[PDB]
Amino acid sequence: IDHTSKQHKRSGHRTAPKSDNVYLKLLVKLYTFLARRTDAPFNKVVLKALFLSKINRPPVSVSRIARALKQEGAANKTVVVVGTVTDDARIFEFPKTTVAALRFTAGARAKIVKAGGECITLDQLAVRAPKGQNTLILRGPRNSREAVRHFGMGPHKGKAPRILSTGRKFERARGRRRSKGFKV
Amino acid sequence: PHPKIVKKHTKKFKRHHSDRYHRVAENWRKQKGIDSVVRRRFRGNISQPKIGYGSNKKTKFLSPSGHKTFLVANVKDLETLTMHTKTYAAEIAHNISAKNRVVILARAKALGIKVTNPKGRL
Amino acid sequence: AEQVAAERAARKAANKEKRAIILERNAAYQKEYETAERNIIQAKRDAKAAGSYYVEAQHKLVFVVRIKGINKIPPKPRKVLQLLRLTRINSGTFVKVTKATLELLKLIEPYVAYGYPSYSTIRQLVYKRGFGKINKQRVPLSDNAIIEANLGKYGILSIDDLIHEIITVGPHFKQANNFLWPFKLSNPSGGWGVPRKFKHFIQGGSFGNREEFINKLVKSMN
Amino acid sequence: GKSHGYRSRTRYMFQRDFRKHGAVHLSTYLKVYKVGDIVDIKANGSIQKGMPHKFYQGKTGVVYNVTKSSVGVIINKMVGNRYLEKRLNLRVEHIKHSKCRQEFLERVKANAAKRAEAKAQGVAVQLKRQPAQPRESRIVSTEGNVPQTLAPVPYETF
Amino acid sequence: PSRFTKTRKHRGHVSAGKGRIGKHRKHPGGRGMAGGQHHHRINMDKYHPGYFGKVGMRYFHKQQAHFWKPVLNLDKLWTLIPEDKRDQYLKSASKETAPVIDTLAAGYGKILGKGRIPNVPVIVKARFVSKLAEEKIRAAGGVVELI
Amino acid sequence: KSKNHTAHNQTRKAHRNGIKKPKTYKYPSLKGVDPKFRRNHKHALHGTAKALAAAKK
Amino acid sequence: HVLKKNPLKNKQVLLRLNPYAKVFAAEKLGSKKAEKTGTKPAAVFTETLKH
RNA sequence: GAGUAGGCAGGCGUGGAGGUCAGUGACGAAGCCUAGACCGUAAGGUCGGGUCGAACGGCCUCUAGUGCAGAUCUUGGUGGUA
RNA sequence: AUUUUUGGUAAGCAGAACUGGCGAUGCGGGAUGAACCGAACGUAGAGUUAAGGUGCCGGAAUACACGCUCAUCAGACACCA
RNA sequence: UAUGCCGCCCGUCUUGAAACACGGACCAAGGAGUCUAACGUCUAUGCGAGUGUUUGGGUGUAAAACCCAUACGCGUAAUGAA
């Protein structure tokens, strides 16, 4: 019985949300059903993105939505954000759209409604698009969180030192310039 | 109806050296010694609890009677096993007075629920 | 909703025409084997009469069974036995004889017994110990529907069609052999003979290439 | 103490060769190296500039940079439990082309010729290579070859 | 929550998860940043390059209120005007109804030029500006009034 | 009093979870390549970009 | 499939898989003869065999 | 389907806390004793009998001075030697 | 610990190379033994074997077959005495 | 309880413990990874270009709950010794 691999190794993927939220579990229930029956690749993506954690569902901005509909041919699709849809006061023009999020911010809800658009849930979406007909699934940038600039620090990575004060006297002298000993 | 009940290990799992010393109780305790013959499992030492001994899931929590034991305090608690007489056996709690046992055994037989304890408390 | 003498009768009619294809195929393979023996036997007799010896074509199929435990196997043979899928003792696989395989058998010789598997022994193995890889989940065959589901892509539609694509090394040998789960044989019926197994067969041991005597061993182990 | 110098343990390998001393023959310099070309690494001890470490002697990499008297080679260096991307800077006498990759790059054109030909003819090409197949059934003829009955020899000194 | 701690899960096992050879002793390296140049050099030079030695010139009695100058980009400039009156300016402000953004009351020293503002006269009042800030405000058609 | 060095178990440790290839990307490391080839190559690629930006009509 | 029965006995799973099992049994193909009046011994093979 | 050091998960038990079972209880709470019984792989749980005499429990949660055979451990008591 | 191997008369000594083991490992065998052989282990039933044996202790032929050996210090199973 | 076979005394340091290595006569009770300031990772929750009521004020069925202004911390900009 010369085992090739690790015996009784877990898949290593979330099969449920560690969230104990009642309304998320009702939403997972709907999408576990649709994922099983529909046999449309969309429903498997949405089920997993519902299981995903706060660090892995970063907020998709309205400005990022406006950019994803700036694309040619994909201007009338429904914008599936699985996570928060945040506001961006940077842009001024916003088109008439329908966006299916978990949560909106009071600013994001104002801007999408004012353009003339429809703020959808995932169940309001599922009742109109069982197979995600004419959808555009988006994700916010994961590798922008402030913790990720310290991941795999060493010489000469150009990664952020974990520090609490940021001026001179704090981690610039020896080993950050050829003058004092060496550089990185 | 039930499959013929088997229990793979009937006799109790007494702690090692519970016989030898009085300070040591026979309440099972895993031998976490570096040289323990019980932990290392030498031919002739006691057997340890292993999940593999786990009773069949269709025969689990059934008494010899074939009824899952349900602790009952009062008539209110007995009156819940009414549509579950083939399934359960009412057992009056240890701290119930003789007069309250008179009432429960009266009601138990009136509904047709098997009881393991009284006895009538003579 | 009738669907009792329409759907049931339709797929029954489909089953009967399929068994009729399988019948004439198994009749074709019986004919293929019996004439192929007769030809080789007559060729040997033709040559003896001519006054000139006849070399039987080098065996192109070998049945490999791992006769060794799992403890104290060095990295080289160990990984070769992981590639032939002999991950436990009395595990059997098939291997098409090539240079890239004959040299693997030279490496793992001290951990296995192998030889030239007859038609009969192959038939008995795939009947009694026919297991398939389907969504890995090792599933017993028990029905030629399960073969022609997964291996119908390559043209094999039956147990006897699979046993054919092994016994006569086919263009879909790789597929048919890798589909078959590694045979889980038991220890032999009357033993090994052989007081000590882990010498080479020639010395009076058991391990290594036992040309035709694998058939006997394997049936005993079956 | 112990010696771990650059050219340490390299008596016999950076040695020149028997009756192949003296000058480098000019084909070495006239040879053209381009990026993506797989080249060997083998130092010429007679030339003591841009010479590789004894590790890289015997290795094969691929040219990544090309400059005046020199190339740049990428080699796979296993250290502990993982390979790294080791960039050498070698003068052109310490390298040569690999007939390894020359025999492949001509097989590609041989396959291209076989297929492009047999697309518009009677087809039985089988483009893949197969290993040494178990030899087919032959008749061996004993016409003036009546087998010689060999016997084993008795022992004798010298 | 003491009952979730692995201390509760450790009761019974001899060494309490700290091993039988390490023993868990008081201070087997020293007490905080000790031997940073000696036996913790590898961890200091990695992860904390630049810790040891001095760099640059000292500043005695450095009041952080001199160096205030908080910054506002042009992408965020229009967010200063309240949303009650915002859209009336952003649709035909146009010279004499050009809105007045006092960035010092908003609590910014400098204006920097990162964003694209809409083509509107947007009279900006800032203590400091970038070359590209005053470029883009004049381009859009406004002005920078220094205060 | 101690011992000094052994490479025993070091292979086993390495092979357990490890020996792994560096993954080989397309468009490789164009760093430590001839600086004047680079200086030019930039202008070549910028030229090809302009030529396809002209071709787009 | 609660039980793997065995093709080689039970006779039913042998007639299920391999319908040719009927024809083989009926015609007795496991007991085919079917010759000979050849018959071709050798010339030199026998002398090289004996020697 | 092994496992020291070690990690993680699922539970068992204790002192208190919020909620609930209109919970049990001088017709006997808790405690202790039991070559009686039943449940649980187990930590443990439940019941019968005795003694006893004033409180205590299930379940959903909160919290911790929360589980002992070893420390030439502490205090108190007890032995064999006798 | 087999194999390659340095120092050393040597070592159950000191130090290396590759691999396998003990450590952290129970089980069958070598009477006993950390490392040898065979095999790695949930709880049971049935069947078959490994190494090792089958006079008696002791489950199993005082089996068959060809030879050798007579010891007033017989000999008797690898590592291993 | 008898009988066949099996079974060295646990805990510990250890390459190696039944050890002619250490602690342990016996029993009850007590008895050892805690709290805190500041932080890394991962996760949950809220709100999200913001966020954080509770230093303080108002209020109160009164150390609770409820409400709240101006700041302030962190974030929304980096790089330089400057």
DSSP string, A51-106: H--GGGSPPEEHHHHHHHHSSSS-SSSEEEESSEEE--TT-------EEE-SEE-H
Do A62 and A30 touch, CB atoms closer than 8 A? no
| A21 conformational bin, left if phi > 0, alpha if psi -120 to 50, beta if neither | beta
Distance CA A167, CA A170 (A): 6
Asked if residue E23 has a cis previous peptide bond (ω within 30° of 0), the answer is: no
Two structure tokens written together for B92: 């009056």
Residues 189-218 of C with CB under 8 A from G: none
Do C133 and C179 touch, CB atoms closer than 8 A? yes
Residues of chain D contacting residue C102, judged by C-beta atoms under 8 Å apart: 132
Do D57 and D44 touch, CB atoms closer than 8 A? no
**Contact yes or no for A3 and C73 at CB 8 A:** no
Asked if residue A8 has a cis previous peptide bond (ω within 30° of 0), the answer is: no
Two structure tokens written together for E65: 């209120």
Separation in Å: H25 C1' and B96 CA: 8
> What spatial distance separates the first Cα and last Cα of chain E, rounded to whole Å?
57
CA distances for A124 relative to B49, E27, G26, angstroms: 53, 61, 68
Distance CA D10, CA C158 (A): 65
Do B52 and B59 touch, CB atoms closer than 8 A? no
* Segment (H or E) for B71: strand B68-72
Find which nucleotide's C1' atom is closest to B33's CA. Answer: J11
| A77 conformational bin, left if phi > 0, alpha if psi -120 to 50, beta if neither | beta
Beta-strand pair D38-41/D60-66:
antiparallel
Q: How many CB atoms lie within 10 A of CB C173?
A: 17
Q: How many CB atoms lie within 10 A of CB E111?
A: 26
User: Can you tell me which residue has the tokens 């905080």?
Assistant: E32
F3 interface with D at CB cutoff 8 Å: no
E-strand spans in E7-127?
71-72, 101-102, 110-111, 124-125
Structure solved via: cryo-EM
| C9 conformational bin, left if phi > 0, alpha if psi -120 to 50, beta if neither | alpha
Distance CA A26, CA A17 (A): 11
Beta-bridged to residue B115, according to DSSP, are B90
Beta-bridged to residue C52, according to DSSP, are D141
Q: What does this entry list as its resolution, in Å?
A: 2.9
Distance CA G22, CA C125 (A): 21
D147, D148, D152, D157: CA torsion to nearest 10: -160
Please tell me what DSSP assigns to residue D4.
-
SS3 G50: helix
Which residue type is seen at C187?
A: N
A1 interface with C at CB cutoff 8 Å: yes
* Segment (H or E) for C138: strand C138-140
| E99 conformational bin, left if phi > 0, alpha if psi -120 to 50, beta if neither | beta
* Segment (H or E) for E144: strand E144-145
Do B57 and B71 touch, CB atoms closer than 8 A? no
Distance CA A129, CA A122 (A): 10
| Residue-wise burial string across C30-52, b where 16 or more C-beta atoms lie within 10 A, e elsewhere | beeeeeeeeeeeeeebebbebbb
- Rounded to 10°, the helix C99-107/C75-83 angle is 130
SS3 B41: coil
Two structure tokens written together for E43: 């961890």
Do D38 and D100 touch, CB atoms closer than 8 A? yes
**CA of G8 vs chain C CAs: smallest distance (Å):** 7
Find which nucleotide's C1' atom is closest to E5's CA. Answer: J33
* Segment (H or E) for D78: strand D70-78
From residues 91-120 of A, list those within 7 angstroms of strand J by Cβ.
103, 105-108
Residues in chain E whose C lies over 2.5 Å from the next residue's N (breaks after): none
Which string of DSSP letters, residue by residue, matches D111-129?
A: HHHHHHHHTTS------S-
CA distances for D52 relative to C16, D8, D39, D55, G38, angstroms: 74, 13, 13, 8, 77
SS3 E88: helix
Alpha helices in chain C (DSSP H): 7-50, 75-83, 99-107, 119-128, 144-150, 159-167, 173-179, 214-221
Name the nearest CA neighbour of C101 among C80, C118, C117, C128. C80
| Sheet-wide strand order for A84-86 | A60-61, A84-86, A103-104
Which residue type is seen at E34?
A: A
Do D66 and D25 touch, CB atoms closer than 8 A? no
**Contact yes or no for E13 and B34 at CB 8 A:** no
Beta-strand pair E144-145/E124-125:
parallel
Polymer length in residues for chain E: 147
Count Cα atoms within 13 angstroms, Cβ side, for D137: 11
Q: Which residues contact D136 (CB under 8 A, 6 or more apart)?
A: C57, C58
Do E49 and A171 touch, CB atoms closer than 8 A? yes
User: Among positive and negative, which fits the CA dihedral E128, E132, E135, E139?
Assistant: negative
**φ and ψ of C164, to 5 deg:** -65, -55
| Sheet-wide strand order for C61-66 | C183-184, C91-96, C61-66, C112-115, C208-209
Please tell me what DSSP assigns to residue D77.
E
Do A129 and A40 touch, CB atoms closer than 8 A? no
Distance CA D57, CA D88 (A): 12
Find which nucleotide's C1' atom is closest to E110's CA. Answer: J77
Beta-bridged to residue C91, according to DSSP, are C66, C184
- Could you tell me how far CA C28 lies from the centroid of its own chain? 20
Beta-bridged to residue C61, according to DSSP, are C96
| Contact exists between A and B (3 or more beta carbon pairs < 8 Å) | no
* Segment (H or E) for A107: helix A106-115
Two structure tokens written together for F32: 């430590």
Q: How many CB atoms lie within 10 A of CB C134?
A: 14
Which residue type is seen at A36?
A: R
| Residue among C51, C54, C58 whose CB faces D134 most closely | C58
Q: Is C215 exposed, middle or buried (0-12, 13-18, 19+ CB in 10 A)?
A: buried
C207, C211, C215, C216: CA torsion to nearest 10: -70
Count Cα atoms within 13 angstroms, Cβ side, for D70: 16
Distance CA F27, CA F13 (A): 33
Angle at B17 between CA B11 and CA B21, to 5 degrees: 120
G39, G44, G46, G51: CA torsion to nearest 10: 170
* CA closest to A1 among chain C residues: C88
User: Can you tell me which residue has the tokens 């008179």?
Assistant: B102
Name the nearest CA neighbour of C42 among G38, D141, G31. G38
**CA of D81 vs chain F CAs: smallest distance (Å):** 4
Q: How many CB atoms lie within 10 A of CB B9?
A: 13
Largest CA distance in chain C: 77
Beta-bridged to residue A146, according to DSSP, are none
The reply to whether C204 has its C-beta less than 7 Å from any atom of strand I is no
Do E117 and E78 touch, CB atoms closer than 8 A? yes
| D54 conformational bin, left if phi > 0, alpha if psi -120 to 50, beta if neither | alpha
Separation in Å: J82 C1' and E57 CA: 8
| F36 conformational bin, left if phi > 0, alpha if psi -120 to 50, beta if neither | alpha
Residues of chain E contacting residue A154, judged by C-beta atoms under 8 Å apart: 46-47
The reply to whether A1 has its C-beta less than 7 Å from any atom of strand I is yes
Do B93 and B118 touch, CB atoms closer than 8 A? no
Find which nucleotide's C1' atom is closest to C196's CA. Answer: I51
Distance CA C28, CA C157 (A): 14
Distance CA B74, CA B95 (A): 11
Distance CA B43, CA B46 (A): 9
Distance CA C199, CA C182 (A): 25
Q: How many CB atoms lie within 10 A of CB C170?
A: 19
Q: Which residues contact E72 (CB under 8 A, 6 or more apart)?
A: E80, E103, E106, E108, E110, E111, E112, E126
Beta-strand pair E71-72/E110-111:
parallel
